[PDB]
Write a protein that binds this ligand. Structure first.
Ligand code: FMN
Ligand code: 57D
Length: 288
């Protein structure tokens, strides 16, 4: 089993160390290990080394991703890798495209793209402003529905590489990812139960009569039993969650529908006159 470790920190920083630590836990379990340090990569924003990177990820059996915490979440670069995962890694779309190619004499997309895969995350911060990073990390897995084994947060971690019990946890995380990689079918989540009984998220967006899991999308209700919170939802919802084939198919179906309505609207005069007025009213300023 090949475990790929990826770090988004400074070269030779803590995130590198925690990720190599995990890689060592994986080798202890017999895995072959590799390491990518994202500062060596050129990756543009979602409007160039990205493909190479995705290639490396597709060939791994499990991945361990260690990211710094910036403004409570992952770095902008992690969000950019999440952005660029859409067009390439959505499991619903790649299932559709493989079916359609097979049945229309088209060429078979990358088999690899549809292989099951396990992934674990570590978020390393310098304080306790860390309340959005785990959800950030979950999003990356959600597009391709990789199985999250561990999704750990490390606050007050500027000097983490001399905190032995925490470097130990990182080692344990690499043990787990390698073990999960040995049997991806029967591998099971090893992290914190959280509140969402499905996502395991603790991030909810709250409006009157509707609490929504910020990760899996389930709409239900949050309950406070003497300061302990908990999340219920109608079973029917499970059809719609964003990390299920059912939920993705619907989601895409809605995209194709609304993208049709748009293309048509773009030919109306309402659309064309309004756009023409915008072009006339102002011009975008740019640097010299
Ligand atoms: C621009 C910026 C924003 C940051 N925001 C947070 C934050 O919101 N919460 C937190 O714990 N740490 C934050 N940090 C601290 C970084 O996570 C820390 O420098 C990083 O984990 C170091 O890892 P490395 O050694 O691999 O670079 C921030 C750091 C920078 C540079
Ligand atoms: O080492 C840090 C530097 C900065 C930081 C970022 C931009 C400008 C000046 C300092 O912010 C932090 C925020 C945190 O919650 C935890 C940290 O360890 C840091």
């Amino acid at each position: 089993m090949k475990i790929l470790g990826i770090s988004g920190g400074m070269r030779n920083g803590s995130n590198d160390g925690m990720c190599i630590e995990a890689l060592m836990g994986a080798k202890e379990m017999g895995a072959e290990v590799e390491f990518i340090q994202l500062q060596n990569l050129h990756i543009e924003h979602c409007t160039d080394d990205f493909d190479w990177l995705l290639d490396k990820m597709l060939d791994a059996d499990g991945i361990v991703f260690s990211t710094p915490i910036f403004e409570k979440g992952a770095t902008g670069l992690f969000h950019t890798i999440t952005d660029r995962f859409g067009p390439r890694m959505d499991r619903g779309n790649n299932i559709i495209g493989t079916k359609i190619a097979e049945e229309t004499g088209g060429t078979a997309p990358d088999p690899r793209i549809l292989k099951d895969k396990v992934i674990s995350f570590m978020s390393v911060g310098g304080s306790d402003w860390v309340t959005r990073t785990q959800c950030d990390a979950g999003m990356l897995a959600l597009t391709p529905m990789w199985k999250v084994i561990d999704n750990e947060v490390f606050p007050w971690a500027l000097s983490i590489l001399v905190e032995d019990e925490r470097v130990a946890r990182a080692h344990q995380i690499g043990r787990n990812i390698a073990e999960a990689a040995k049997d991806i079918e029967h591998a099971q989540y090893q992290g914190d139960a959280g509140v969402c009984p499905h996502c395991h998220s603790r991030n909810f967006h709250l409006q009157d009569g509707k609490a929504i899991c910020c990760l899996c999308g389930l709409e239900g209700e949050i309950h406070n039993e003497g300061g302990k919170y908990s999340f219920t939802f109608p079973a029917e919802q499970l059809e719609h969650a964003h990390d299920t084939l059912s939920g993705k198919f619907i989601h895409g179906n809605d995209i194709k529908e609304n993208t049709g309505k748009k293309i048509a609207n773009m030919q109306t005069e309402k659309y064309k006159a309004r756009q023409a007025a915008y072009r006339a009213f102002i011009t975008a300023t740019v640097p010299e």
